Specification:
The chain has 123 residues and is an all-alpha fold. The chain is built from 5 helices and no strands. It is globular and about 40 Å long. It starts with 11 loop residues before the first helix and ends in a 6-residue tail after the last helix. Belongs to the SNF2/RAD54 helicase family. It is found in: Nucleus.
């Protein structure tokens, strides 16, 4: 099973870490201005595109991932990875390979990992 009440609110050292990563991933750009996270901001409704929810297991978005950090939901950094990686995979599953949205997914990932290290942390 799993347990861990949300007694005290995550510290500034942890919360910040989460933000840094994402804040960088979502802000990360590839084209000459055309961001990628754009197509990863909001998702299609269940009525318009239901099939999406049929194949996709957990169609999560970015607005939700962030809403959690501010909701003291995520217990540890790992949790963030579970979603972040999910929000990406979901795409590679829907969007064809070597496609426009595809490549992006792969990129966002490379940025996520790097972020963890390359951040505001300045000894």
């Amino acid at each position: 099973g799993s347990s861990g009440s949300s007694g005290s609110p995550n510290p500034p050292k942890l919360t910040k870490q989460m933000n840094a990563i994402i804040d960088t991933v979502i802000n990360y750009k590839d084209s000459s201005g055309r961001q990628l996270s754009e197509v990863f901001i909001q998702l299609p409704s269940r009525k318009e595109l239901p099939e999406y929810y049929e194949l996709i297991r957990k169609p999560v978005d970015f607005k939700k991932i962030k809403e959690r950090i501010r909701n003291h939901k995520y217990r540890s950094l790992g949790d963030l990875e579970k979603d972040v990686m999910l929000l990406c995979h979901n795409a590679q599953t829907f969007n064809l390979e070597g496609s426009q949205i595809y490549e992006d997914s792969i990129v966002l990932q490379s940025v996520f990992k790097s972020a963890r290290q390359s951040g505001p942390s300045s000894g």
